[PDB]
Structure 1
């Protein structure tokens, strides 16, 4: 079980963050693999990928994702200047994170339509500390736990719609959870 933070494991960047509540076990495995097992967690997000990400990376993932409650499986990352937290959501649990959010378009990529949304976080944790930032979402209609994500299709569609990204910070395949339980085992490349 790993200490919250960032680093490198078996050639891949990882980031694992939680809110301190307890109930999450994040582990790094061989190559691009990571696992998450959680039981009555707080808020958390962790996984493997790259630091920094790029605006045209093709990201592959495969494995198992078994949430019980509020959780997502995504390509997850940040930009700076502007500060943006973004999600290309491939699967989720009890909650579609776009519920009640303003829909900003659609994009077709990697075998599914995705619906695009923007939300905002005010005075919240971020890669630079407490800050205000928009969140950009592409939410896959056809849920899956394996596939490839052509990130450029999302970032280009977001830009077309007026959702600008700054300089890329980290970019991972991640499990997000919010006060839920589950298990997952995911391999990135």
Structure 2
């Protein structure tokens, strides 16, 4: 049992996905606001609001993020030609989502140092189907649940490590959970 929901709401692109619809509730609210509540330490989900296509934009977000276990809060998006999946992790719970990726330096932006990582996913699900694509990570050391993200500064930093970003696909502020519980209300702009 899986459920994936995308579209435009309040003037913003939204995307929600889970393999357990009964333990996660995603709620579209006005403008770029969305809420997600998950319980029972069962299921995997990713949801949030943003843009399609993304861009080198300044993403402003604010709200409340209350994970209890494996969960992360991140700007999350894709590019095409080349195929790239990227994460700007602003906060996370008991697991660093970067684990397993290769260290690739630091970048200081938006009031904190971010640790950069790169990784390759081999014959894995992607926005274009099963592909081999590159991953870029920026993990904030000073975890926060509100502020501004200069995406261009990470796009520039990543381009000095490996292949440069291609044409943008979707770009959202995502709340994620993996067999955990929590609640979150965020508003992007």
Same fold (TM over 0.5): yes
1:47 is aligned to 48
Classify 1:163/1:105 alpha carbon distance in 2 versus 1 (closer, same or farther; 3 Å). farther
SS at match of 2:159: helix
Q: Runs of at least 4 residues of structure 1 off by over 4 A? A: none
Tell me, in whole angstroms, the C-alpha distance in 1 between the residues paired with 2:91 and 2:181.
15
Classify 1:72/1:114 alpha carbon distance in 2 versus 1 (closer, same or farther; 3 Å). same
- Whether the 8 Å contact between 2:20 and 2:42 is mirrored in structure 1 is no
SS at match of 2:42: coil
2:126 is aligned to 126
- Whether the 8 Å contact between 2:76 and 2:171 is mirrored in structure 1 is yes
* Number of residue-to-residue matches in the alignment: 186
- With 123-132 and 161-170 compared, the bigger mean Cα shift is at 123-132
Deviations 1:29-52 (A, max 9, x none): 111100111112322211001000
Unpaired runs of at least 5, structure 1: none
- Whether the 8 Å contact between 1:18 and 1:43 is mirrored in structure 2 is yes
**Aligned pairs (5 A) from 1:26-175:** 26-39=26-39, 40-54=41-55, 56-175=56-175
Classify 1:72/1:20 alpha carbon distance in 2 versus 1 (closer, same or farther; 3 Å). same
SS at match of 1:156: helix
Unpaired runs of at least 5, structure 2: none
TM-score normalised over the length of structure 1? 0.92
Tell me, in whole angstroms, the C-alpha distance in 2 between the residues paired with 1:52 and 1:42.
28
1:6 is aligned to 6
- Whether the 8 Å contact between 1:136 and 1:163 is mirrored in structure 2 is no
Deviations 1:12-42 (A, max 9, x none): 1101122347421111111110011111232
- With 102-111 and 40-49 compared, the bigger mean Cα shift is at 40-49
Classify 1:122/1:42 alpha carbon distance in 2 versus 1 (closer, same or farther; 3 Å). farther
TM-score normalised over the length of structure 2? 0.92
